[PDB]
């Protein structure tokens, strides 16, 4: 296996030592925390024959200092990787309550805030050793990539490099200030996802809302509908033979499901922070589902900036949804406020460890607060929970309850035929909402075939494979970076162009500077370029 990198950056021992050992010194100065670490662990002094069967590679301050003094480190990452082995040996062998487990953690905390700046003016991203959170003994490591001119290794996630975006390879940031080069534009951006009138309504709505507070840290939000597709919900086999063979409810119900996500600009790059799947039952769907929308799933990662605006924006999105479908012609909407099972994530592959999953009452209350200003903003006229609504309308048949795909009710009914039930309704009153917003329906928006977001399973699965975690701000940015590459490139629709006056087909064409999607034939107010 041969090596080439003609003008590599090589660090001479004194360069490395002179820069890196200010950091080792900070660790030695921690008294008493550092004293079990100034020496290699001696299992016969400590009475733990355990150790070398458990820790297959001991490491300690003294060893790292001698490696540093003799020059056994060629690249700084080897120095960094050795102390993390020292910490990792500590955190492993010892119980999470040990004294030296803690000592270590204080040492880890100081090495974290010392190594990052040093490694940065050595031209590197951080001085951290990163590994992906466990899946179903081993962890997978964060990827690295090497600058095409430096040869110096950096965290793929730290510098957000992706070959599909920049196919000429990765080149570092100061080798571009010396190249005179600025980095080519990332054209695979959340904003540049295909725009739709639904998506525009919600981003246009929250955007000046955020200006309504004008907090300095706020950045742009892009809302995009990334998948849209006509589906049919089959009536499940219990109610199957008892209501449709009779002919009182339909065999299937046609709906249009959409998946839609919201992104914010953080540190200059798209971060995805909200996702939702809806079911829209139009005006030719027969009773009981006619003119009804339903929120299958909703999920969130909390890194929205600033956090004192976070939830407000979730609401304005939801508010904007009912505002949008009201006008298109929908009349009632239906929420099942059920908080995530397990450590089961609804949409996003791996939530932050310290993001709290609400108690159902908290989420119920949340949805009630959300609804209260839809009423007040003159948007919906009111809303009840399912019983102050079911028997206000005096429902008595099992066939009158809206019948949605994957909803609770189709399956409680499903094997209540197998074996009473108005009681199983009334226990779960506050988890199911019914929203009154108020001539056929028209979805102006086209259909977006994008299998990845055709239901929540495709996206979760692919992130698990590819370690697109939403665990931290930095991992969030990286899996947004790649989520968007998947949406842009391997979506299932490719585009025929039309010229807005001529009805006609175009390939050669002129496009407006500012119009949302406006081309016109060579065969007007706007500045146009030839595309
Ligand atoms: O930040 P929120 O407005 O998030 C609302 C969401 C519904 C988007 C969110 O909860 C989410 O990501 N849900 C994922 C799955 C889901 O909701 N599925 C249902 C689809 S119908 O508000 P939260 O409700 O998340 O919490 C706000 C504050 O309350 C604290 N908190 C949440 N959960 C808690 C539990 N179990 N115990 C104690 N406190 C809990 C959070 O820390 C939040 O407080 P801050 O001061 O903002 O940190
Ligand atoms: Na342990
Ligand atoms: Zn890094
Ligand atoms: Zn470089
Ligand atoms: Zn024309
Ligand atoms: Zn025009």
TrEMBL record:
Domain Bromo span(s) in chain numbering: 29-101
Domain CBP/p300-type HAT: 187-492
ZZ-type domain location: 494-531
Compartments where located: Cytoplasm; Nucleus
Protein name per UniProt: histone acetyltransferase
Lineage: Eukaryota, Metazoa, Chordata, Craniata, Vertebrata
Residues of the whole record sequence present: 1079 to 1746 of 2441
């Amino acid at each position: 296996m041969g090596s080439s990198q003609p003008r590599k950056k090589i660090f001479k021992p004194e360069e490395l030592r002179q820069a890196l050992m200010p950091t080792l010194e900070a660790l030695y100065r921690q008294d008493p925390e550092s004293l079990p670490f100034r020496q290699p662990v001696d299992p016969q002094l400590l009475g733990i024959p355990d150790y070398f069967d458990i820790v297959k590679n001991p490491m300690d301050l003294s060893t790292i200092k001698r490696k540093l003094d003799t020059g056994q480190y060629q690249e700084p990452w080897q120095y960094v990787d050795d102390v993390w082995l020292m910490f990792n040996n500590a955190w492993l062998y010892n119980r999470k309550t040990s004294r030296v487990y803690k000592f270590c953690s204080k040492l880890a905390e100081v090495f974290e805030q010392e190594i990052d700046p040093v490694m940065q003016s050595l031209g590197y991203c951080c001085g951290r050793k990163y590994e992906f959170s466990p899946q179903t003994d081993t962890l997978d490591p964060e990827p690295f990539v090497d600058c095409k001119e430096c040869g110096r290794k950096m965290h793929q996630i730290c510098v957000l490099h992706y070959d599909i975006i920049w196919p000429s390879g990765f080149v570092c940031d100061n080798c571009l200030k010396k190249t005179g080069r600025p980095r080519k534009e990332n054209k695979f951006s959340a904003k540049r996802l295909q725009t739709t009138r639904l998506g525009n309504h919600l981003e246009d709505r929250v955007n000046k809302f955020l200006r309504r507070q004008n907090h300095p840290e706020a950045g742009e939000v892009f809302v995009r509908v990334v998948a849209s597709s006509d589906k049919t919900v089959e009536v499940k086999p219990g109610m199957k033979s008892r209501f449709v063979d009779s002919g009182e409810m339909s065999e299937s119900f046609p709906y249009r499901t959409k998946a839609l996500f919201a992104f914010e600009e953080i540190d200059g790059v798209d971060v995805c922070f909200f996702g939702m799947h809806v079911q829209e039952y139009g005006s030719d769907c027969p009773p009981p589902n006619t003119r009804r929308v339903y929120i299958s799933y909703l999920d969130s990662i909390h890194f929205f900036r600033p956090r004192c605006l976070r939830t407000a924006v979730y609401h304005e999105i939801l508010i904007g949804y009912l505002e949008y479908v009201k006008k298109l012609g929908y009349v009632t909407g239906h929420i099942w406020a059920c908080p995530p099972s397990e450590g089961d994530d609804y949409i996003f592959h791996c939530h932050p460890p310290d993001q709290k999953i609400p108690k159902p009452k908290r989420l119920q209350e949340w949805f009630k607060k959300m609804l209260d200003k839809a009423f007040a903003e003159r948007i919906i006229n009111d809303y009840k929970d399912i019983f102050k609504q079911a028997n206000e309308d005096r429902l008595t048949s099992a066939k009158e309850l809206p019948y949605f795909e994957g909803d609770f009710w189709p399956n409680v009914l499903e094997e209540s035929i197998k074996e009473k039930l108005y009681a199983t309704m009334e226990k779960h009153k506050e988890v199911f909402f019914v929203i009154h917003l108020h001539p056929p329906i028209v979805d102006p928006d086209p259909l977006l075939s994008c299998d990845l977001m055709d239901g929540r399973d495709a996206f979760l699965t692919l992130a698990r494979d590819k370690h697109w975690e939403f665990s931290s701000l930095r991992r969030s940015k990286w899996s947004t970076l790649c989520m968007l590459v998947e949406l842009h490139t391997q979506g299932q629709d490719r585009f025929v162009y039309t010229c807005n006056e001529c009805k006609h087909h175009v390939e050669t064409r002129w496009h407006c500077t500012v119009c949302e999607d406006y081309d016109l034939c060579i065969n007007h107010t706007h500045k146009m370029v030839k595309w």
